[PDB]
Amino acid sequence: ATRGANVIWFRHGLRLHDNPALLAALADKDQGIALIPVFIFDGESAGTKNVGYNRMRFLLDSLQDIDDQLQAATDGRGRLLVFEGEPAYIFRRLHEQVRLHRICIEQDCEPIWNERDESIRSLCRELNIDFVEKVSHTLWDPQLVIETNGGIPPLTYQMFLHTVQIIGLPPRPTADARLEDATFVELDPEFCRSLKLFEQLPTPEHFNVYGDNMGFLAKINWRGGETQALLLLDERLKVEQHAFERGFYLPNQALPNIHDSPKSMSAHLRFGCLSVRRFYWSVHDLFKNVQLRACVRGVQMTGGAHITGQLIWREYFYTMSVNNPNYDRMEGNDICLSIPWAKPNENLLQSWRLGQTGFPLIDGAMRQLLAEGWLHHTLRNTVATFLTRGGLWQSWEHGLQHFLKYLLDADWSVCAGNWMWVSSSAFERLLDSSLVTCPVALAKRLDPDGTYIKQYVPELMNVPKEFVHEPWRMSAEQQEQYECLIGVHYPERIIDLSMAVKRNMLAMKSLRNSLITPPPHCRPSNEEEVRQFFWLADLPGTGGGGC
Amino acid sequence: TRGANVIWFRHGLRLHDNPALLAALADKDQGIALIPVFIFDGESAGTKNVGYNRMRFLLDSLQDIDDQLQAATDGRGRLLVFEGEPAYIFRRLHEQVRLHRICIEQDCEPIWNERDESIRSLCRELNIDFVEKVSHTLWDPQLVIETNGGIPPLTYQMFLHTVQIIGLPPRPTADARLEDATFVELDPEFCRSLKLFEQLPTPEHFNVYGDNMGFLAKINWRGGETQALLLLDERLKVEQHAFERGFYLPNQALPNIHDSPKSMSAHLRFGCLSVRRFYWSVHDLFKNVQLRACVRGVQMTGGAHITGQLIWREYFYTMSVNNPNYDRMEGNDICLSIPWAKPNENLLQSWRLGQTGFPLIDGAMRQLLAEGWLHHTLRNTVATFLTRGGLWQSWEHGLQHFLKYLLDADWSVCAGNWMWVSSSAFERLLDSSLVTCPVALAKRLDPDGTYIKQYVPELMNVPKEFVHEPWRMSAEQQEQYECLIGVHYPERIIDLSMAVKRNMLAMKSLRNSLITPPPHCRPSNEEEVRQFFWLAD
Ligand SMILES: Cc1cc2nc3c(=O)[nH]c(=O)nc-3n(C[C@H](O)[C@H](O)[C@H](O)COP(=O)(O)OP(=O)(O)OC[C@H]3O[C@@H](n4cnc5c(N)ncnc54)[C@H](O)[C@@H]3O)c2cc1C
Ligand SMILES: Cc1cc2nc3c(=O)[nH]c(=O)nc-3n(C[C@H](O)[C@H](O)[C@H](O)COP(=O)(O)OP(=O)(O)OC[C@H]3O[C@@H](n4cnc5c(N)ncnc54)[C@H](O)[C@@H]3O)c2cc1C
Ligand SMILES: [Mg+2]
Ligand SMILES: [Mg+2]
Ligand SMILES: [Mg+2]
Q1: Ligand 1 neighbourhood includes A388 CB (under 6 angstroms)
Q2: Is B82 exposed, middle or buried (0-12, 13-18, 19+ CB in 10 A)?
Q3: Where does the sequence pass through the membrane (chain B)?
Q4: What is the rounded distance in angstroms from the CA atom of residue A391 to the CA atom of residue A438?
Q5: Which atom of ligand 2 is nearest to the CA of B316?
Q6: What is the C-alpha separation between A505 and A426, in angstroms, rounded?
Q7: Is B137 in the pocket of ligand 2 (CB under 6 A)?
Q8: What is the DSSP string of A410-460?
Q9: What residues of chain A lie within 8 A of the CB of B292, using their CB?
């Protein structure tokens, strides 16, 4: 704090590697400019506006990871300062203590962050402070791929692939930061109490966040932070290594597995614990210059396109929301079809949230969502269709707000886009087939021996495998013979699906004859894209049928 | 006149991409004439073990060349078709008009060695240039074998790795200009003494008649170069629709056994269509464009899902080069010696005639006798049922029957595919019932019974729910539709559940006896088996 100080404000991108904003904050070590790493609980940033217990713990685990790494490389001189209040109020009064030359941040391209960031930009113009903004949460610059497509984001996944190949490959991750020679600031102890500088790392209880509806089914647990994200990346980079030397995927690898352990990095990518560019260019360097022939779920393995294509799905949804604050709703949302959803049935909606629908796979997935906060992509498709076009004809907004609260990742743009991609695509009639919107048939495909169902629906523990997916088929004597009387211990089906899929298919067909014009909306590229999205494989598409 | 060059046709019955032909016209400005020659010596172009369908195909291609030679020369150019010994014909042809060069296309298969070396020792005597050019395969098989250390690659993945080192295959040559080419009209008595055909002969001239049934063949094929080019341009438009769509329709990815005469395997066997023209046409149509979809476990970028099929053809041609025992078990170093049962002429005849009691097996073998072409999934079914997945008979019996009635019937490809499927004892998926059961495959390929009812017409009155398993019908059902297990349709000539049971024991006993799996023709991995048999992958 001799000649001033630079601020690296953390919101997302809670990491030290591949942090251009951190490097720009460390670029004045020679001039004696100090470094101040800060995180502010302003009541919305890092997804704290609508958060449950599982994601708040994940965020606090990442803040501690940054805090422990700073001390491990600065002999204890480096400290992550966690505040709680208005960001513009904290930065102005902190400028009274030490001179702020540059305030470095990572670009949050989502429009819900525009108010927060433009107030800091307006503050720096008043105090003559450099406002440094770096793009590192996404692979490309969202404004660069939007202007390439003519000032509007691509609405289909293929239209996004066509534009990024024009721009080229995304930038490589930056080098690591050296903090052994960096100086920090010891400010006034009373100034810390006024601006609410935490002396200890807070807990979710400090923010009135306690155990959720189910508490916790401690079968799957996730430790946040940059250390665990890099530990899981190397674990997966070796699984791809074995499949790379093998040249093909084992049949058990290409199939969706819902009985596995916490290996997903979607929560580490949302908070920015793991760099998306480091994920991308680690797969690229491991696959380039080796031609392959086998595929993984209809996507080639040559060049790692089956892995890096997943990171483009995330980039494709992040950019569609940039200049659209109504992206989470349908009124005022220009790229979402207006579907006549039924009236809010909060009795059925509560049966969907609590996992009391009478359908085993739906209940087992929603109870895992409440307890553990993570669902497989196949299970997220099932509960989304069952709530919307597939089962109850409820608006996807009621499912988005529930997901954004209990999900570990819960990207405001990725989660909202996936709800519209699946529920509000009227001209993709393959989504109306019960062969893709039936949880009973899918239960036999993902959970053959009822291992997953009985693990998160414990009332079905003793029913034999011949009646797990269809408990209603048991006799009156058999129902009390396995401690499961449908309607008492296990709830009955809140709706008849076979008569519900008929109502919804005709109600959606009614929209198509009224809208012969297909307006620009978030939709699948083609029918082949639906089959890979819903992990169909053997019998999907036109002419595939039931073999 | 002064001299003449001979373009001798054996394979490569075409005018385009014919480097041997271009070498014959290379001395056009010297006053050296041209002599197109095809000799029925009793073995060339697969005429030693041939049926009526393939002989009809060969003669259709010879007429195409003769018709093309007249349209480009206003009647001056003709195709000379002889019948006799090639070295005797060429020697007496040399004293009528001096032969400077004898140009042929390379036949790398060892069954043609004694024929070519016979002509080779003749030209060194009479001081004639023996020009041999490679155009039947994508690469020179010697350059592929020598790159692999002097031995041919025994797995398909080992082959793709070797040709990747060599590089992309050569592109087809330019078309030949025959508008200013001179020919010779020989002495009429010389044409009488050398057995020169005036009219193109018929299959009946070679003691070849209309098979056993013959009339069930209404899906007929017409040989020739210009007609093979029509099939190439036809599929090129189908592939660009998928190229512009970005993916294959599900009905396209599924095998189709009730389709049209679409295949070009017979045209590529006789050389009516150039394989390099086939390769580089698909390569130019898919280049510079990145695709992400796949076709049955193989990518579509660069046309690898199409060009990879042509590499299967080269992979079997290259393996048989220095192995004259490639079509037999004894003395074949690349074939596992499997204890096959003693030859049973009753079950073998029921396999050929299609009287085994299994509907899909009967419909395929009866289609082979009439039309002489089967889908790859149907050739697999009748091959496993004859060998490891049924009767446990030697693959040598099925090879001779296939080399006789097939339209393609490449000596190296057909034998290689027979060993690849039958004698792969260490590929344990090959013995799974998903591959060794035609009943489940019948409901998978021909669901409603359309293909079975037309090639097994004794089952057309049987409804769909009993057409795949006619033995399951009751007493009044075998009479209401009149299909008794005995007089109308034969009983299953073997117990399939018991046969596959005892055959898997013999393969394990073979593996337990062979602690070393010696280098043999085998699949590369289990994934390669799924793609080969059109499985779920
Ligand atoms: C209703 C619904 C809501 C979803 N909400 C989210 C969300 O809030 N956050 C989120 O990251 N993903 C979301 N997804 C996508 C998908 O469910 C997860 O990305 C996936 O389950 C993560 O598992 P994984 O990393 O092991 O899969 P991988 O195949 O390893 O995915 C690699 C990465 O690619 C990205 N990705 C994968 N699939 C998609 C997709 N369909 N759309 C966008 N990005 C994708 C993620 O960042 C993911 O971590 C949602 C999908 C649905 C159907
Ligand atoms: C027991 C058995 C015997 C066979 N005998 C022959 C034969 O005598 N001649 C022959 O050309 N093919 C043979 N094959 C391969 C296969 O049956 C045919 O190549 C294929 O059915 C031709 O149909 P298509 O051209 O429409 O297929 P496509 O997929 O269009 O094939 C493209 C071309 O690639 C080549 N090709 C395709 N598959 C193979 C293969 N497995 N091995 C070698 N070349 C291949 C052929 O030249 C074919 O025309 C045999 C396969 C088996 C199982
Ligand atoms: Mg992951
Ligand atoms: Mg063909
Ligand atoms: Mg399968």
Answers
A1: no
A2: buried
A3: none
A4: 9
A5: 43
A6: 10
A7: no
A8: --HHHHHHHHHHHHS-TT-GGGGSTTTS-HHHHHHHH-TTSHHHHHH-GGG
A9: 161, 299-300, 305, 309
